[PDB]
């Protein structure tokens, strides 16, 4: 009975594309950065861990 107002944009042609990277992938990147920082300090930014 009530339009959610996303449907009006969709019906008039105003759409939103999804992002390429999912939130799971962003969380995996932050987990990798955090684990590398905790385990190896700053040497993983230069060479190996």
């Amino acid at each position: 009975a009530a339009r959610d107002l996303i449907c009006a944009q969709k019906f008039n042609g105003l759409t939103v594309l999804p992002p390429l990277l999912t939130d799971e992938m962003i969380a995996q990147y932050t987990s990798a950065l955090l684990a590398g920082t905790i385990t190896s300090g700053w040497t993983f930014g230069a060479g190996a861990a």
Partner: protein
């Protein structure tokens, strides 16, 4: 979605925000 025309002339079609069970006017379902 295509490679270059120097490679091949085979394309794929993505229907944006359309459930595959209502696709008509292989088949994979994405977000």
């Amino acid at each position: 979605i295509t490679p270059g025309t120097n490679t091949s002339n085979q394309v794929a079609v993505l229907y944006q925000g359309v459930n595959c069970t209502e696709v008509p006017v292989n088949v994979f379902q994405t977000r």
